[PDB]
Amino acid sequence: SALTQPPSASGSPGQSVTISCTGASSDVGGYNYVSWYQQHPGKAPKLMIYEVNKRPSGVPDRFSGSKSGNTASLTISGLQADDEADYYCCSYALSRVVFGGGTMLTV
Amino acid sequence: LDPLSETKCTLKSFTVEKGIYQTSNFRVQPTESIVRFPNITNLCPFHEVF
């Protein structure tokens, strides 16, 4: 299926924001097949949040993820100036990666 | 061809004595059409496992 993301997000530095991702599919393996990517304007994307119960190495604890039912959530504790980028969620459940519409997070 | 040839083949002989002397055959009415009635559902999600 196709993923749905808000058009843009807004939040003051210091507070927390939440990005929604509805439309994640599932299979006989599990329900945690959700990943997030951050792409700054003028460069390639980078894997930030995948397997929301965990997180990759070299990534600060500011980026957190969760999922309730068929909706995924991206929780960012602290907002900084270098956080203005497009955040896409990806569903890789049925052996097929699908990228959402994306959101514009500005501080 | 005819009941005479049928009872000849049954008795395995070209000469048949007086009387029935055997049972010719058994009548079995065959079918003339087919009646299939499966269920009406949607496509099975086989992609969720494979």
Swiss-Prot record, chain B:
Residues 27-43 are annotated as: Disordered. It comes from the Viruses. The gene is S. This is Spike protein S1. Attaches the virion to the cell membrane by interacting with host receptor, initiating the infection. The major receptor is host ACE2. When S2/S2' has been cleaved, binding to the receptor triggers direct fusion at the cell membrane. When S2/S2' has not been cleaved, binding to the receptor results in internalization of the virus by endocytosis using host TFRC and GRM2 and leading to fusion of the virion membrane with the host endosomal membrane. Alternatively, may use NRP1/NRP2 and integrin as entry receptors. Binds to host ACE2. RBD also interacts with the N-linked glycan on 'Asn-90' of ACE2. Cleavage of S generates a polybasic C-terminal sequence on S1 that binds to host Neuropilin-1 (NRP1) and Neuropilin-2 (NRP2) receptors. Interacts with host integrin alpha-5/beta-1 (ITGA5:ITGB1) and with ACE2 in complex with integrin alpha-5/beta-1 (ITGA5:ITGB1). May interact via cytoplasmic c-terminus with M protein. May interact (via N-terminus) with host bilirubin and biliverdin, thereby preventing antibody binding to the SARS-CoV-2 spike NTD via an allosteric mechanism. Glycans are attached at residues 31, 33, 39.
